[PDB]
Design a protein around this ligand. Structure first.
Ligand SMILES: [Cl-]
Ligand SMILES: [Cl-]
Ligand SMILES: [Cl-]
Ligand SMILES: [Cl-]
Ligand SMILES: [Cl-]
Length: 215
């Protein structure tokens, strides 16, 4: 069902990091997105049920957990938790550009769903040893995002320039937090422009910012 969101109907998805004591990192941002999308897309969504599955999935958790929450249009929901494996602090992810392009007019790109054909295809273009993450651009050659991350580029001034939403990408939760804190700013740029970035990162709510290098 999660693996066949392209031929069949799709599900809404949220991937979060649960932490001892403080629970899900950026929890309210995740629920805001999930509840907002369910409302816009016509998904039955019972918050009491969402809280139930999350509470059961995290019952007895002793350390950080990667938690995947999924919602089907009929209101059916699942939550899965497994130990979070953080990246070493000195780890730098290698990025490559997929030939797979996104369509800026595809409105479904602003919802995190199981309809991941484009991203799965982009990811299949490169081996793990060739790219830790694969970036996708749109019909105007503007970088949008990674298959599972948003992009943040520092062209020298300390501001994390991240692709503007109208380029065709997921408004990520980490992305949103960085924008609201004044740390990131919307911008437009190509793969080639990134070569002039003094610092580069890709990130998501689960892992935070990940230093990256373009190839
Ligand atoms: Cl938050
Ligand atoms: Cl729909
Ligand atoms: Cl942690
Ligand atoms: Cl932060
Ligand atoms: Cl702009």
């Amino acid at each position: 069902p999660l693996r066949d969101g392209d031929t069949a109907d799709f599900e809404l998805i949220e991937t979060m990091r649960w932490q001892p004591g403080t629970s899900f990192l950026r929890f309210d941002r995740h629920l805001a997105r999930l509840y907002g999308s369910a409302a816009e897309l016509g998904f039955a969504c019972d918050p009491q049920r969402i809280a139930e599955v999350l509470s059961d999935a995290l019952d007895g958790a002793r350390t950080a957990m990667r938690t995947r929450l999924a919602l089907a249009r009929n209101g059916d929901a699942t939550a899965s938790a497994q130990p979070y494996e953080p990246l070493a602090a000195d780890k730098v992810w290698i990025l490559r550009l997929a030939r797979t392009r996104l369509d800026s007019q595809n409105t479904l790109l602003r919802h995190k769903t199981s309809r991941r054909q484009l991203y799965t295809h982009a990811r299949s273009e490169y081996l793990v040893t060739q790219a830790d993450e694969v970036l996708l651009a749109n019909e105007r050659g503007e970088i949008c995002e990674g298959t599972i991350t948003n992009v943040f580029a520092d062209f020298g001034d300390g501001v994390l320039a991240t692709p503007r939403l109208d380029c065709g990408l997921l408004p990520g939760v980490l992305r949103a937090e960085l924008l609201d804190e004044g740390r990131a700013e919307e911008a437009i740029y190509s793969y080639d422009d990134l070569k002039s970035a003094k610092a580069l990162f890709v990130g998501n709510s689960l892992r935070g910012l990940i230093p990256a290098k373009l190839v």
